[PDB]
Amino acid sequence: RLVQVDCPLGPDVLLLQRMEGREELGRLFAYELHLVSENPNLPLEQLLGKPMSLSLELPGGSRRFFHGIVARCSQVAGHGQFAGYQATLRPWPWLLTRTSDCRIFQNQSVPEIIKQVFRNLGFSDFEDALTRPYREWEYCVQYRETSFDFISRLMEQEGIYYWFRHEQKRHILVLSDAYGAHRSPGGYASVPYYPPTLGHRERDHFFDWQMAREVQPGSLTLNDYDFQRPGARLEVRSNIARPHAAADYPLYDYPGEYVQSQDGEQYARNRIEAIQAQHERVRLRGVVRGIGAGHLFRLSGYPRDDQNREYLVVGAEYRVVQELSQFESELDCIDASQSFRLLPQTPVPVVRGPQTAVVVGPKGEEIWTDQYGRVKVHFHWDRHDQSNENSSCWIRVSQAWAGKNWGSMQIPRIGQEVIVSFLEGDPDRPIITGRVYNAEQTVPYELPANATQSGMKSRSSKGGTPANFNEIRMEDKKGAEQLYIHAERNQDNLVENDASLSVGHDRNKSIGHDELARIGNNRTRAVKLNDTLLVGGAKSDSVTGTYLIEAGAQIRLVCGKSVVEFNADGTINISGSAFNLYASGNGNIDTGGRLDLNSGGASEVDAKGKGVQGTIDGQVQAMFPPP
Amino acid sequence: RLVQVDCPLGPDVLLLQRMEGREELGRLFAYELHLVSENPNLPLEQLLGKPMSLSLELPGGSRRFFHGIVARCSQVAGHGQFAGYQATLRPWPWLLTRTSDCRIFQNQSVPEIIKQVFRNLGFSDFEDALTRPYREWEYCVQYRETSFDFISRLMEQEGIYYWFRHEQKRHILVLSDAYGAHRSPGGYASVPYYPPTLGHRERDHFFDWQMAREVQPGSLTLNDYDFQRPGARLEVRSNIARPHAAADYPLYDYPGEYVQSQDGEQYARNRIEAIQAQHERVRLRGVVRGIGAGHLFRLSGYPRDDQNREYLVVGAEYRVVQELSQFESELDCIDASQSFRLLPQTPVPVVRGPQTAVVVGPKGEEIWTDQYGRVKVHFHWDRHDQSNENSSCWIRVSQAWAGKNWGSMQIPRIGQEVIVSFLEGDPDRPIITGRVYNAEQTVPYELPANATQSGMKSRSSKGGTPANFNEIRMEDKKGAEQLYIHAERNQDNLVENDASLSVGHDRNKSIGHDELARIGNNRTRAVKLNDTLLVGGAKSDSVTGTYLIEAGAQIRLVCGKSVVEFNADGTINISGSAFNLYASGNGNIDTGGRLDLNSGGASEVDAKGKGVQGTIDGQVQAMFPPP
Amino acid sequence: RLVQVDCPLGPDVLLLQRMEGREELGRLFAYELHLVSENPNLPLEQLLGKPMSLSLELPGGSRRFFHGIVARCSQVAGHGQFAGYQATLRPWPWLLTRTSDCRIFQNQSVPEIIKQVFRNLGFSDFEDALTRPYREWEYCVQYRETSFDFISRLMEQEGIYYWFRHEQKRHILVLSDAYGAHRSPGGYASVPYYPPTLGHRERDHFFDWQMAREVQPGSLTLNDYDFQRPGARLEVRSNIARPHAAADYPLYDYPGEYVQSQDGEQYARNRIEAIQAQHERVRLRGVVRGIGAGHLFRLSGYPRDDQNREYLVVGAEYRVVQELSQFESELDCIDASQSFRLLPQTPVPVVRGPQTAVVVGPKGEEIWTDQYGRVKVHFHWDRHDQSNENSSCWIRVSQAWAGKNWGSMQIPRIGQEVIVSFLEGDPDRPIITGRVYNAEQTVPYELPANATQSGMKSRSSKGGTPANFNEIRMEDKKGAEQLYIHAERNQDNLVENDASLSVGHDRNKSIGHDELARIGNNRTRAVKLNDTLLVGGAKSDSVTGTYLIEAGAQIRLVCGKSVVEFNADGTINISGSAFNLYASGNGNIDTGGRLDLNSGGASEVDAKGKGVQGTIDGQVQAMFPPP
16 A cells, blocks of 8 residues: 554654655665645654654565654645655764764774764664774874764774664664675565566566776875884885776875874775775666665676676665655665775864963873873863873974984973974874963063063972072173073083183172082182182191292281291391290301391381281171171 | 836836846845846946846835846847846945955954945945944954955854845945844735735735754853963853754854853854754745845734744845736745844865964064063064054964973064964964074074084173174084083072082183182182192282191292292201391290301302292283283 | 767777767866667776777868767666767876875976876876976975876966867877967868857857856955065065956955065966956857867857957867767857966865974985075975985974074984974975974983983084083972083183172082183182192292281191291291201391290291191092092
């Protein structure tokens, strides 16, 4: 009689005036449901967005459900017999387009990731019929895209495709990597071909047919780069030849998003097979019902016996017409022994430009890095991360100068706001290209007042304060320029060879404790004018050889009352309270003139107020006054 | 009669054989007309690009105007009686698609900006029927886009739309953000629906009606970030419940282009209104001459009574056929209870990489910055600005090391060629990323010659001449390495605790004026071999405690003829022209052997030319030779 | 009669049942050959990818040759004698879409680059009929695009076109930018027009015509910038006008991708002239067999005199059907006097973000640069070069300060991995924005193990090893802070004003050889406690002025047995083994008490173990102990 609308609100509540079903491997199904009803104003929103099915009398009397979700709907002007209720029926996955995200995945397999999305969604009606094992993707960020988009890209990359199973009350997103996950139609595993020239045969059969071949590229070369093995060559290449002429045009790519040549070949292969599947296509149109995408069936009756064979349907469509059933269907397929693949046509969220993030790591860490200077960050957009070393993977950082164990070293600290960019805008390839001072990260030299100051102030780690720093500052202030040097605790200046110091004006040197100055060879120095030395304690000179005290004018010695004068003319005056001159052997005293004693000739020698400890110390304390 | 025409080259001269028009709220209109004329060579260019209208014979003989500008035209097939001509009318706003530019706006509301654009255009034919106040865009820029594109984006951002309105001799852009901006045509306050089963009615009526339903998202989350207030959780969310199922899917975006979540909500509301408006669509077809886009009317006669409502036409189709006549129309409308916010369908130019900018400010300034180190810059593409502080807003800049009141920093100067990009390529979110040398701004150490020279050279400010600078110059030249420091002023070497200096060879030191040396505690010095000290003035030793002078081989003192020789063998020789040995108390002169006076045993010890002040001077000036 | 087939699988085996020819200047043709053949199972793959030829009978029996290659071949349900097949004939350039890569072209004219591609693919079937000279570009680059796309784009941007010639067995790509490479249409130098209203005039004439007009812009201003001539005003502008209302709408782009304003003007014209042309075009239809794209002929018979002009066919349509027959043609043209201009409609691969590369240069270099500090790099994506100084053009690099011969200067060396970005994503505008470390280019400080020593390392050049370098480090280690300097050779610290040193604790200086110092004024040295000085050799002080020695407590002189004690009470003890006191004039000795000689009251002063020599030497050796 007719195809009964086995749906919500009853079956007979809706009658199938006409249906246009559409199925495709690796894509969302779509069905036009021209359902009609005795209810002249059946509130459309009551089934809009809800699951429903349709029961098609298949071969053997079996039934094909056309289950999906009412994606869209519309009432249609009609007649007292019935009102039209057009509806677009589509599988759960279109719902994934209704939520966008900016979520980081880390070392997770594609199945893991996708299923996790499903777990997040609460999606259960799906099935894992993969045929190829998967590697965990060390980093994979969902970014400015819907879950649908994200997963779709993961799918095409991996050569994954889907088929959906129609069940009266549900519709299963079946994951498949190959024909082994597919099945023949119930009561229709094989079908005759009865060309249109025969009019019609009651057995479901095919009658329309088309075969076409196309020119394709000779090969695909991919390439990539891994800084951890920088000199390694990751270039790969898939070479395929076809029956057509000139099959010799190579394609090249970089980066291919892989670190092993085996992945390069796998993904090149997935892409190539998707392409190769297009080399020759088979089209069929019949009055068949059982067949659909993801089904395996054998054609028979076609003049070409190389067409009379089993096929895996890639594209399928259905036609139902019922006066208030007529039935047609058309296929687009590949041989049943093939593994369907799709090209990565899903758009890639391109990182349009720079985005900052907070440097993070372990909560008790401050310089969270590794041997490459890579760090973890917290992106401002990542509303789902842990703001720690698990918020992202390690990210390389630019330097002022960077070579083989030489160059600058400014390895980020936690809490810094840094600028992240992506290699060719690819969210999975971050790199730090800058650092920005902000309300927290404030400039060493208060701006704009100290805009003329430049250099660097550090901060001790771990746990150093803003006072605990080493620094260098060059004051540019015209007329008051200045080089400030600050060692927070130590200065080791190594001058491997010769050293030189020049001061245009005055030298102010001071040290809190002791100072040792040893000269490997000789030392010579001079003071242009007066050379004064104050000693708060004692003074001791030790020359192994000869020590010459040379001076023009008068050399003077004063120690309390001990006073000695050494005039340039040799008039040497010596005195104090007493004296004792002694020779263990002989002694001689002579004069050029007369020598007398106990005569009053010699007299006391004036100390000039010198040699007084109190005075000396006063000078010393003036030199070293208290702070 | 038929349809009346009113245009350049003659009103009656052209007869509208047929017309296919289209108007939409917030969008450009288009009228395709086929008119015929007794002029067998009607000059296309004399109406192409020109304003003109149609006087549609409304009820009562009133006329509905369809004024527009001939965007396109064509002499087409026709007859000797009336030659055929075709033309496409478009709005004055459409004309903006013919012009493009690169211009920055700063602190202007969208209404303000657009009206200024209108002033630039001379576009006086518009109305301001907006009820909401709009935020001044502190920075917003037109870049490589048409003026139309630019303002279209501004509108969509703020949700602004409009109603094209016509007058016999002009075309009006009725700017709108409110239902009250729209209105019914005279006699079209309530336009009836007279079923198609009636064929045609004498009263402008509708005969078609269609309603369609669509699944909408359920939540919209927007966010943004402010470095000036880094904890600035600018997250904001709009939510909506819909009649259908699956009315709960969340969306997320960041940055939302706002600094206040409330502004974000405006924007969120603009978007969610634009979105939810797609939930249900109402279509009508009739023979109605008056109601079109931006018009109000109550549907009167549709069998489904809850459709006999007042509607606002979102857009409309206009149809003419003429007997050489019937005017017909189709409406796209929303129920009076609904509002409208322009849908975000216009694309935006993206800054896919770095640009060159000039640091600017006051014309007499060298550093134009604020407390965040931000500066204003001038863009090469912004040919409208005067290369000054008004060229752009305060822009953030990457630095060597951001730190909280510490770090490595260098303040930018006016006239510098800098590397600038945008946050995520968004032209309204500028950020300075670096600096680069050029033909004028040459490297500190001229290349390629000075590739071995590295570090940095500053300049004094204001007035940093080539001489006025401080620098760090490191020489990596193999065999001629160096660590050179230049402090054009004072230099402060602070070492909080311990310091050390290692010199592989010789060390030279020279001070232009005096030297202060204050050893907090004890000083120990030594020279492995010889130590020479010269004094150009006087020397003054002042030791608080005991001052011991030891010489392993000989202590010698010479001041001219004053010569004292202390031989290690115990022989003490003292010579000069005279002596005065005196004890305040007693004294003893004893020998183990014989002591003879005027014996001839004592003589004058050779001074060796020492103590000759002139000789000494020779040595001093040897240390301090001219200049 | 008809169009005869000349092809693979046997010329007359295939019968042109229906052919849809499509031609256009500056665009690849397509001839859809619907053929029927006595071969009931004609191979598809043996036409596919192969050249095929047609011989369309013209007046006089002349055969208009067609030639192209099959991009697609399909088996169409047909009969025995006439089995249907469908072939897509494309021009050779179509095949260039089958290959894609990347590559840099330096100092290459576009004509040459084109020919390079031809040689690469063996595409000898072309004719160089270009008339304008083209710029030798220092840098063009193919990237992620087919060779076809690359060249097509490359041509569009320079105003280059490519035309075609159907030889019988070959199809020639007549490259040309001037109408001298056009021809009269095989003897149809003038083609009469017969109004369709006259009926189908029995001969090869036109039966249709359509002129159409459009509103155009009025001005295009482009601008660009060159840092090597940074004051450049490369801004260009070319203007147009049209018959319609004021064609005065300005356009503006920056950068316009040119370094020469003359070139910029041409580029403006490359866009503009086509835009100008967009104003008016003509469609023609007839059954004219010898006309087609690139043909120049006069239409003769269109009622409007203005249309009986010479026209250049821009594009064309052909339909050939055969009975075993009918022919029709239609075309898009411009007046022969109108200059054909190709718009830049091919997309340019956008550099979505940063790239990685390595600094390269001549093998004898370690640093390869120029007067701008630019470098050559080899790119990690550049899988098509040998990695040398010609692997790129000169590329700029960011710095910490870019001033006029001042600022920062870090120098990249050959072998360093670098970050390369492109201005606004423009593949022809590379710049280095950061240096990075990798497995080979390791970090100078161990990480995280030695992240506390912020700073830098270097290598002497040329030929400096890890032991030959200069380095700076800052220990930020909390509680172990330290500044450290390594001058591999000498060090020079210049302070032009006052220098100061403050060491909070202890300081240790060690000079490898000789130290020399001088004070340009007086000097005030002091210690707060003890001051000891050891001289391993001899010591000599030469004070040109008075030399006063002040000390409290006691002054001691020790040289072997020659020892003097100066007590603060003025008791002066001078003694040893012998003495010789001599006045060269008079001598006086007096006491206030009794002066006795050989009294026994004088004795040898205790040396205190000092003035020994060997012991003293040992002390010095303690001071300067062996390694």
